[PDB]
Symmetry: D2
Subunit: 394 residues, 4 copies
């Protein structure tokens, strides 16, 4: 059978705004930071790591094609450790955790780090005609960030697929704005109560007035009210729109990681862990409706775990767009009070390749906060996919 996977430690950066506090930190710099910190939290030597896997979508510089290896080596992991970068779009961060967990399940490693790192502020433009020349006529610089946010089959923004989902599943503008407002209020309450303090790694952000610690998610609106969202206009369609800048997730910068071990290695070391991995699942859907990806992925994961929706104490289902996040909660029959109890992509931001790892960290720390047992982590995936994993607080 497959070895049991224990999540012993986890950490995330605070999430930076587009062009904001982390704009000068490369994806490999952020990844190295969370690698070194998870090792310290788990009391694991950098020489004792069997595998490193990082999720990451938008290469910002040549180093990023080496992202997992640079994050590992600069995070203090020995050079004998293999390192893999994976890309499943917005599912990449949770995919990294699954792929790292798989090396343990299969006996290839007793210790593995899975994380994600993304700096969208530093996403580049390309010049396709630069290598061999354009000769004559105007050419383009291609926005690789916006390009990543376009479905590659119809060349429509993710936000257009969110309208497709809104229309198909009956998710009104008012429903979307209610979810968005509530996400910000939940995030502001979590910040005010200190719910995120233990799971965040502060970053010193060298300012001209001296160094200051960036340790709070800066996308959150702390005094938001209903009229802030009603006044906004739809951003992705010219007719009959519902998706706005306020009820869509942000574009953001962050990194996060967990350190996992075989259950036997965790017993022998005597660690006091966060959780164990119960099950995971993948699904594919119509690309034009990629936002409901989490529905089949969650149903499959629950089947593998032998659990039911009502067994879930904590659900982190990323708010890519209120339009799809509502449809997911509705189609699954989830209690909105248990779903994203401290906010999600709309209020905290959506650093795409890191999101899936960062919301895993959130989920496991929330289980500890409430003494809960099972958490579900799931998210939708551009191109038409879903990914889901279930963890047990132990």
């Amino acid at each position: 059978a497959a070895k049991e996977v224990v999540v012993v430690s986890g950490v995330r950066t605070a999430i930076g705004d587009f062009g904001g506090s982390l704009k000068d930190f490369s994806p490999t710099d952020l990844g190295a930071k969370v690698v070194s910190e998870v090792l310290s939290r788990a009391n694991v030597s950098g020489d004792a790591v069997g595998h490193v896997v990082f999720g990451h979508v938008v290469n910002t510089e040549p180093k990023d094609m080496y992202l997992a290896r640079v994050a590992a080596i600069n995070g203090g992991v020995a050079q004998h450790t293999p390192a893999l970068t994976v890309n499943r779009l917005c599912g990449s961060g949770l995919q990294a955790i699954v792929s790292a967990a798989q090396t343990i399940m299969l006996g290839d490693a007793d210790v593995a780090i899975g994380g994600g790192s993304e700096n969208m502020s530093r996403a580049p433009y390309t010049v396709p005609s630069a290598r061999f020349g354009q000769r004559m006529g105007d050419a383009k610089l291609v926005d690789m960030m916006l390009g990543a946010l376009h479905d590659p089959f119809q060349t429509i923004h993710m936000g257009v697929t969110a309208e497709n989902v809104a229309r198909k599943y009956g998710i009104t503008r008012d429903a979307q704005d209610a979810l968005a407002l509530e996400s910000h209020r939940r995030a502001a309450r979590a910040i005010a109560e200190g719910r995120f303090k233990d799971q965040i790694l502060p970053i010193s952000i060298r300012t001209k007035k001296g160094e200051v610690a960036f340790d709070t998610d800066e996308h959150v609106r702390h005094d938001a009210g209903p009229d802030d969202f009603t006044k906004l206009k739809p951003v992705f369609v010219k007719e009959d729109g519902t998706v706005t800048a306020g009820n869509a997730s942000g574009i953001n910068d962050a990194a996060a990681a967990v350190l996992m071990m075989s259950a036997d290695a965790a017993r022998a070391q005597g660690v006091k862990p966060l959780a164990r991995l119960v099950a995971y699942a993948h699904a594919g859907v119509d690309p034009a409706y990629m936002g409901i990806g989490p529905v089949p992925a969650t149903q499959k994961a629950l089947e593998r775990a032998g659990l039911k929706i009502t067994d879930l104490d904590v659900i982190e289902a990323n708010e890519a767009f209120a339009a799809q996040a509502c449809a997911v909660t509705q189609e699954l029959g989830l209690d909105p009070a248990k779903v994203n109890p401290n906010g999600s992509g709309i209020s905290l931001g959506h650093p795409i390749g890191a999101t899936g790892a960062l919301i895993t960290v959130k989920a496991l720390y929330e289980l500890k906060r409430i003494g809960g047992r099972y958490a579900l982590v799931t998210m939708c995936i551009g191109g038409g996919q879903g990914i889901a994993a279930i963890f047990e607080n132990i």
Copy 2:
């Protein structure tokens, strides 16, 4: 862990930098080999549990969706998950491993593993373009050359090949020797038609009409030892040995294999090419990445319960003659069994697709000689190696 069988495989011919495939995007090449492996195995596009593609250098936004685009446009149903993986030059074998693991773990009965890379279309980036440079000249960054630079010392992969040449005693004469033979083995393979069955031809619409690209165009068919010893070292100015002639080329290509669980294969009447025996990974000093295959291979043989002398076929990619010689040397391999039909130096090195492409070669060579065991291994920029062993069945 379920048993994993390869039922089909295919590759494109390997295009030169700026050559016959320069107009074919990585997702275009990927979809072509996906469709072809399904039809070779006679497997419905609706029956695929997972698709994994290796790929390193994004040439356009669609490339961040590469596996999904290759799968959908290759005829795989939208309900199949798709993953792109990047372990640099090991990415193509990694995709096959990652796809096999979905089968081993019971997540899927059928999985496609492949790789796709178009280095000709590798882009230049402008890191200052989004928020501006404000004042002062700015950089147009060669993402292809940057992929070929170690990220810790910012030296070309070829500088690490020189390091490996010094440490292990690989001479210039030795490097040019392997390079010449590789070209001679490749030219012989092409003449005898050894690659015919494993290559998917591609129509490369020319002004002269509609021609088929089905031959690896990097090969020098008239090569003589003088051709290599005249060239000059290109990566270190003095006391150097790696040249353009004894180093792999920059190339474009795609390849894939389709795998199934043993049970699912039985239950479909599909004559499997081979079976997966074992795989392994290794990390090494980045400055000496070219020696990564040695520990990875040793670790793979250990897991397989096999010895070097049990290998009838070895596909060990020739990133640099300086590195490939030291691999063969440190492992104790018979050079007649290693890359018997050429490799990176002669056939080219389409980095993200290479590991999948030489897996296809290794398996077709096993069938050609009636062998049992084949080893596939390659080095990895940044300091790693990857290796896999297959059994002809």
Copy 3:
């Protein structure tokens, strides 16, 4: 002999900061604005113009290679009028006036417009390898703005030549900072007293809060004191520097123009003009000391006019760098009280191709303000030149 040239009207925009209030206004848009306004001030039909000449240095878009013609046609000048763009670097704006005056002197036109337009905020980057490709290796985007500010023989910033002049002519840091502070105080006094109101054309700058009129030079520091300049560090040399961001001219955006006529056409029409052109002169100097260009150019112009330094009531000598502006005043024996009485490039900005026309407008309006008789307009020129003209209030 040569016909006498009357300056009947003139106008300038307010000067915008780098990245500031005029950043969205192209050079041909600004030029068209001042063309239409000078025609209106002089009561001259757009169908009665014999020639248009504009100074302009840094092309921002393809239209700018047609700059004079676009400014003329869009400013309401008939299509039968010839239009010429000239480039003598920072002397271009006054060169345009001289070249336009020359068509009148030679009997080619009885009416001619001379102006300058520059938007440095919109200066582009080029990609030299884009047309035919780079093939392999990194390339560069070339800053055409900074490039224009580099001497083309030694590839040193204009600011390095300013240090050369400071050293050769004994212009201390304290002397440079005294000039800079005084320039801002003079500009702030002129603004507070309304000295510039009649010569500036307001521009409506479409903001999100509604339209607002940009009519005040925004580079001026109104509460400047000596310590603001002493604290700054030298910007152009690593050793023994004196030139700073505070005592160097700014990078700026603006346009300006005058309308001239033959004296006979001015008599017949009965215009009430600003001034007449008395003389002009050019000079070349060592490129490494281009900042003293105005000295020989001024001496030559005075000789042609049969005037002496002491006959000058108003001097507009552009403050490119305090280092050279001091050396010019010192070598010529000018009274600093008469030189740039209302500020200059350090305080108001230096929109290079427009500066020479804009400070001509300043000079002629200042003559009217004080009832003076003769004004000198002069400036230094990258590559090692000077240009000067003398005008008489009539």
Copy 4:
């Protein structure tokens, strides 16, 4: 207004787009013709009162200093003022006019007027690069093609040539006729060596050694009427006539003339080529800019007190056959006296240098036929024309 004499002149051979001069910057070419005109006239670099160069498309930062760089690196003293002027395709004749005016007004006794343009090196710009694009694709702007677009309707100069073809009745057969003859006149001139004395050879360092570029390489020496009537219209899709064959090329070159006051020439013993008789400017409808030469020429003849039949040589640049035919037609010129040795269609159109270059041709042709009066005129994008008349002396 003092009398202005031309004592010397020179031009480069005209390079094709991407051809033999592609590696020579505009300031490099400018300095070469500056040095050569000084030495041809035997005039000290210290004796020059003014330098003016026409030039349209900045290829690099130094180009904004073009006249000054051409003058200094061409041996002119640093005390000489230097001006760059831009009247689009008239810039090269404008520079000669502007330089002559400094002499006419007594500001100078000696002045150089020239032009320099390297369209091959014309750049792409990124208007968003300084302050950033933030989000969304951005433009890489072709500054060369943009220079060839009218700024009011954003149509190619060739679209205005079609407008001119309709208004004045210039047929396709008529255009291809002029194009063929131009090429035949140019090929004859080159064969007979007519351009030998006016061309400054340039060494264009090749891998085959050190070769001299001294022949206008746009010329088709084997041209036959079938070559032009087979080509298709390129600027309007339907009901079109201007083709790649009957339109001028995109080209690189430089040229200059040195002028002095009559007195200063006498006082130096310098045998002057010719004398400036008159010049004139005209504005026209931008949509019909190609007809600008007609009023400019009429206005120049009026000032000169001459008639069309007094002109022994006419250099009227062939921007487009459609436009040049209408110019000759509306002025009533003998086509045997107009561009007797080819022009823009056959020799090329290095825009900023053209007006200076064809002035050199016109003067050398006057000496070759013993003529008296020569006319130099050309059209101007945006709707202008410029014309000058010289007297052989």
